[PDB]
Amino acid sequence: MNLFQTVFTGSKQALAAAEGIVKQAVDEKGRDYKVAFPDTAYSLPVIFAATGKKITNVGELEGALDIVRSLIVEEEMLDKLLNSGLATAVAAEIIEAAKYVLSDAPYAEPCVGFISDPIIRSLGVPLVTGDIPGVAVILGECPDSETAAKIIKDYQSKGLLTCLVGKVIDQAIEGKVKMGLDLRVIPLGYDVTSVIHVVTIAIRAALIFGGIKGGQLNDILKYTAERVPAFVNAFGPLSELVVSAGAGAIALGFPVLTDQVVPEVPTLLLTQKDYDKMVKTSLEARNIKIKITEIPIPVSFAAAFEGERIRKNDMLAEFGGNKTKAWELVMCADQGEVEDHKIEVIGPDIDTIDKAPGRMPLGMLIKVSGTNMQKDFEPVLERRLHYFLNYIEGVMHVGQRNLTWVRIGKEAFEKGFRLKHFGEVIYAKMLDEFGSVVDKCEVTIITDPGKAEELEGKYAVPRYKERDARLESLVDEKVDTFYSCNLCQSFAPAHVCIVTPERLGLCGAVSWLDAKATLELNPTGPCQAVPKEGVVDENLGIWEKVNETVSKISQGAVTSVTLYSILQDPMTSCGCFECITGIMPEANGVVMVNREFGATTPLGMTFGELASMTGGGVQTPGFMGHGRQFIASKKFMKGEGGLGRIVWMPKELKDFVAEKLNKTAKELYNIDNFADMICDETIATESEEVVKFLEEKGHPALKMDPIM
């Protein structure tokens, strides 16, 4: 008997039992006798959900058997199997409803039977806020009472609401599990049909919290599959009826886990014989995550502890800097390569220090695994390490990659701080902050001189080199989506920043990869994806989708923009920009000025006047606010001949930019040192003197077509 035939057989047995008990209700109470569940507004919830009909008398209960019959179509296709599972759920509900008709109180304690609506509203709020991570539906019998008690109390200690059906109720009592609604251990009943009492909880959750009307069965099934984190643990031998009821749980999107050999279906029907891993298997199968309440560290952890300076003579340990070799790395790894919550310390720990200072290499290798985890997200998470360590009092860590040094004072050592607590804090904060992209985190602390250098060469430096290569090799044509940031709309109501690989956010702190990471981690944040579809001008950078997105985000204040031009519908500026670029017509070029420059410019205005004229989210042709990384870009003024039009620039800014600027101008086929053609404030500031310098030096901008 295959899976489909087992489910069909179970549904027929459920129908047979429903018909028999309905016949008893008709013979003893008559078809006019009232049918109801204690304290509910949804009548029989499963039938109300599936059909929208409320059943009030016994005669209608007998007419509900046709719903079960119409749901059993014995054709071996997945949809029929799910419908047959729902047939068992409807039949089980009819059996439970007839129980209340026949006997006034059909359930005796500890069994609670039906769960009233006020209880659902009572536990509905924890279900939405995640205070209840999931619903563990445990039915059947475990090999021994202690095995059941261990699994049940494991779910209970994790905050899950566990419901019990069958002999596990007695096994848990023998195992001394404290049962109650406040204890989140609810025994429903000894019969298999009592599992419908937790099914109606999920059904009424859609009815009450989802606001789905009765009869919208597909919407209700969609709701329970996405919103109700329920799963089934079926222990002991499974009859056909149990399997058909499990098909009902699968029909609601609830995966079924069992210790029995079954025809496994990936993500839906799974066999796990190891009772020591059943809880972890179920949490993974239902995508349930349990949040850590507090960091298991003796040293207090708070955000106000950042920036603390701690005395040099109190420095028990000091790694990194010019003295020792230290490095940190966060790398994406496959699930096999990283095991969850594994803090490994290799080499001597800080206890072995017996002198006032400490000097030993430190290497922190962090492996993160997740479905949505990407290599481009590695540089972001690693940065937060700087912060995650600084929130611990007694330790100060500053630096980047292999340039980090960490100083640990002796007060933390007296409190009980060790190197494993680094891993504890890193794991807890990675699972907190990036819990939407990180599933498992493994932290390894290396202190041996040999393994620290071996792991840095094997793992650290290749990651850094490939990150730099990706940062340098990304261009607009390679990617297919840009990003839009409106974080500066708090003070510039019309400003929309368009982030592309070769156009950085003009604040200087948002990049294309940063925008992608922000969108992934904070979907309702300021960074939103902009598909690069509907091109109009490739040279000027005009896209219909970009214009539509700018129009929508700026609330219609800005209609059309060009990414690569400053004279035709230029991008707006807010006021965070580091540099201002302004058109100089007499030089047929452009001049630049940073915010640190206080003297006048050949345009005749200082940085303050240019900032007042340019910023505020207003489209001002001929003037642009941008960061320091955009000067040496191949997209800088691509619509007006490129960066070859730069004719004046402050001396310090020119010295800062010269290398990359010369590289890009060599791409332009200009001389090895193109920055020498750029006038400085010391060389000449008056416009006539600037033009004289440009004519003397043969600046290319003088030989181009007119800029405007």
């Binding site: 509203r121 709020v125 974080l487 709309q489 109501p493 300021p526 609330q555």
Partner: protein
């Protein structure tokens, strides 16, 4: 000359607070506030009166003299307010749940709210404290106890929006206030979060922030203008919800209103300054686009109601 015909594609949604014949509706407009010459103004802006669940000790002397024999019992205070002044709604502020002050269990405040909501017929607005974590548990217990009266729960910030939304709209069929700090983008974000949770625009109102005149007031004015223009002019669906402003929360707390005549003899009557501050703040927020205002002094309520009647009528 051509008459200015400003046609807006957007329209503010309507939210109903309260049950029975006293229930009020907010929103429904398609033009700027008091622009009866441009089209349809949905519902008249509402004026509510603020009361406390404990005796008001920091309030000015005239206010304590008005409620001398009723402020001790919140039920008696609410009945007196509903009888003598008959406001559109009553905002019961649970000051006793403040962790900074005389912190109280959520059960006591829920009991007080249940007692108040069963004595008055006007719609009730239950406002919590400034602590998000305390607010979540407090509103859980308050919405559980005050079931069946369609109350409004204030300060469902992004930190605890799920808890207040579930314990409020989803479970006990109440309304909620999505609060954002003087930003149009933050208001959009909280509205989108509420919509993704499962709460549509007919089940919550917005609080884009409030401030007294002269204390960050231009930011409130600009936020109201931007939200109204985006919701109506740009047809932004994430901002088409009515806005409620607690004016007395900040207007009566400033130095220009709290100081008595003894402290500043040149300023004059303390009650007049308090009423003037309330009236100025309320008039500004009403002109900028709010749909309901919470006031404290009865004279302020009278003046603001007359102001609304003159502008709309």
């Amino acid at each position: 000359f051509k008459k200015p015909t400003q046609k807006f594609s957007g329209k503010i949604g309507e939210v109903e607070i309260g049950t029975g014949e006293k229930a009020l509706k907010l929103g429904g407009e398609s033009v700027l506030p008091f622009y009866t010459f441009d089209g349809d103004t949905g519902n008249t802006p509402k004026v509510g009166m603020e009361i406390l669940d404990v005796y008001p000790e920091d309030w000015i002397d005239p206010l304590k003299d008005i409620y001398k024999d009723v402020a001790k019992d919140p039920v008696k205070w609410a009945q007196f307010v509903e009888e003598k002044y008959s406001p559109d709604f009553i905002c019961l502020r649970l000051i006793s749940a403040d962790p900074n002050g005389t912190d109280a269990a959520p059960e006591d405040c829920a009991k007080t709210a249940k007692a108040v909501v069963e004595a008055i017929k006007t719609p009730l607005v239950v406002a919590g404290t400034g602590n998000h974590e305390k607010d979540a548990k407090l509103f859980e217990k308050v919405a559980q106890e005050t079931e069946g009266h369609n109350i409004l729960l204030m300060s469902a910030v992004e930190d605890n929006y799920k808890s207040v939304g579930a314990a409020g709209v989803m479970a006990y069929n109440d309304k909620v206030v999505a609060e954002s700090s003087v930003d149009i983008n933050l208001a959009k974000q909280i509205n989108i979060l509420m919509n993704q949770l499962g709460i549509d625009n007919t089940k919550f109102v917005d609080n884009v922030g409030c401030a007294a005149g002269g204390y960050g007031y231009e930011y409130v004015i600009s936020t109201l203008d931007r939200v109204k223009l985006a919701a109506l002019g740009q047809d932004d669906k994430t901002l088409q919800v009515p806005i409620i402003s607690p004016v007395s929360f900040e207007a009566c707390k400033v130095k220009e209103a709290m100081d008595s005549e003894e402290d500043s003899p040149q300023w004059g009557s303390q009650e007049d300054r308090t009423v003037s501050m309330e009236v100025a703040t309320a008039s500004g927020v009403l002109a900028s686009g709010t749909d309901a205002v919470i006031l404290r002094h009865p004279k302020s309520v009278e003046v603001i109601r007359n102001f609304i009647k003159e502008l709309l009528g």
